[PDB]
Write a protein that binds this ligand. Sequence first.
Ligand code: ALF
Ligand code: MG
Length: 872
Amino acid sequence: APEKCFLQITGMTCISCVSNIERNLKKKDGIVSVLVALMSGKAEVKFYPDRIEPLEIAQLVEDLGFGASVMEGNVELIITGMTCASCHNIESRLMRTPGILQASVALATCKAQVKFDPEIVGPRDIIRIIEGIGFQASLAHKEEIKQWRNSFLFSLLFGIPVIILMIYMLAATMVLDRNIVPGLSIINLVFFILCTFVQTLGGRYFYVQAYKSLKHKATNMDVLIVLATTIAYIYSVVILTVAMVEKADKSPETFFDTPPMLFMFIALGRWLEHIAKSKTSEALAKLISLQATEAAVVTFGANQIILREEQVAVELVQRGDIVKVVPGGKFPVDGKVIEGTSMADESLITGEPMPVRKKPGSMVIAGSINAHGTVLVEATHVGSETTLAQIVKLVEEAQMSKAPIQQLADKISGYFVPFIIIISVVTLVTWIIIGFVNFDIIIKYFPSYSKNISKTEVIIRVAFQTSITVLSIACPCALGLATPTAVMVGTGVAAQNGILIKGGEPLEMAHKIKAVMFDKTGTITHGVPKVMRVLLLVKMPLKRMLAVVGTAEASSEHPLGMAVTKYCKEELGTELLGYCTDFQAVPGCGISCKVNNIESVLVQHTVLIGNREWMRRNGLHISTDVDEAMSSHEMKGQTAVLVAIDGELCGMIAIADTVKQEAALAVHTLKSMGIDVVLITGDNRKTAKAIATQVGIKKVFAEVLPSHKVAKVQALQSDNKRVAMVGDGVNDSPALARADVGIAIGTGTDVAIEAADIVLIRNDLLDVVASIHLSKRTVRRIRLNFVFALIYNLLGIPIAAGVFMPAGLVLQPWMGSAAMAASSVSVVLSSLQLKCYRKPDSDRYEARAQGHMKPLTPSQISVHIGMDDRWR
Ligand code: ALF
Ligand SMILES: [Mg+2]
């Protein structure tokens, strides 16, 4: 019992791997018990220290074929009625009981924390003790959109009148120019009030965002707008104040137009950007729902002593408890099957729908679907140690590992901010130099000389005005709309094309994909078995035999049986099945039936269906020719079942999974573009190799656990490659979250759909190629939009700086407004034009692969099993 040792085991890929390890280790003398997990690769061994040593245990595990290395409980409860400090009694009683290390209770919140050894004490014991005492105990982004929307609305409310007044003044006005005081004017006063409101309210979020950006040692669009608007607002106030002091006859021109203009559009762009980025992460909630909510704890044993059956919450269960699973109910916790035989569906881990036989001494997975009978399970892993919980942890880690991507607008603004400052400073110094040296150019191009102020003031004031005009014109207005507008339009195109894209990230990353991994079941081939071929081993028509088999197999519940029946129905008129029929079945051995309704088949004695073992035990042998056919069929990893009548061999039926017709074309198309194709699946190597040969995938991975899939994705990403994961099962969810781009089949599991960032509503593999092409068109359009959001402003900078002054061109007041409309309209029109995109026709893909596509020999395909390639 004492000196329990901890071991780490690698190279295990099956639950049968765990069962063999446990059985062999327990068989050896000295070893008392062993526990181990599949994905965690962690094991605990209890043995007598005086008989065997940890080094021997590691050597024994290594001999089994799995690498072994030697390496080194808290409960929170809420208790009612904790209104008195004396009820100290609870803590003292807990300390008295063995196996409890510490226990404390807080009177302020009635919360209690207990630390103990799980192997000796559990939460149930503490709860029972508390109940006995006399008290009950029980175990314990949109903000950005809202604030951006508020800022945009406030700017629009206090910014629209600013634009309306400007249009009225420019288009047409002497009344508005009337001066209440010599330095100010009614029009100027209105501009100042509205601008102040916009800056105080609309610019509040801009200031903090820029303030936060500065703490990040980086500059982005928010910093650019804040600096530009603040400078323009400050200068306007100063010129107004000096004009009032100097009581000038004519009020100076103010730059109150800019801050309302930039805040409105930038806030709108940021609001649109965050709306597109909005997404849901309900995948974690779906995974939690899979776990069972209750278990049927048993008392004593199951041989000759049984007293009570108690419904206990899964969280309250502890290791070593015995639970009962009814058929159709989920397994509550991982454990060992004792005195129970039934069918278990383990699509959570391996992903296939084929049930796996469970026999006493075997192991089960939490969340697996039980059927065919009742089962008694001895829990071994509970709580977060369950396999399902480990998957949830992997999904959480993958989601948290997705760092944010810097927007192209922010990157452009990073270089823009120094650029505008440099030209603004350069424009200031040169104009000051020009005025000081000559002072004649200023008079010719500026009537300000008529004022009585000194010459130095005129040259300084004009230089400051010219530099600031350059700065205001330089700052773009449609920069924020460049990316979000195209992204939203691109998403609409995807929706019209049967592709659902969650957020704008996938559209900006699919074009970077260089490696794609496809799951086998459901993704590359249909998830339900289908009859592949039928052969004849007196010589009745094949159709009559098929009808006879269908009637006998009508009541069968095996997926193969129903697949055979539907295939027979399709081959026949399937008007109605025969009435008279007797059914008898030996599970895992075969099925026998009595059919005497052959007349019904003719209008439209004994039937035996089974395998090699059934024939051998029934006195029927296997011929050489038929045996060779079975070996060839089995070589392709497909099931085969033989039919006999009245003890005489009749024929054989082969059932195999049919690959999607477009899977081969999609794989070839991806390869033609220089994108690697990888087939990763949890099925046996034989089936994976056959599927890969059919579709032409060079790299095949088989017997892969969910943890292994994440590792493979991480390994591919480590090589600077972008990985696009395609899957439909629960086991694929952690890979989809970890992958750069996640694609979920439309008919797949709910968890897979939520985890994946892209959903194929039309469940056609060609959409993966189409999505990459659609992303390429979007990114190219986004860059063009940025040009439209900068070229108009860039062309205006020389005019503001006065480069074209000698040519007769001057910065007219309406140019600033004109630049906005041209840039905003151009960006919107450019983004909207993406709606004309059309999905490439399947004929084009076929024509492009008329001769390039060619089947691949099975000998050239390399099959790798496991992560370390320990096995062949
Ligand atoms: F269908 Al799979 F891994 F083969 F999810
Ligand atoms: Mg699948």
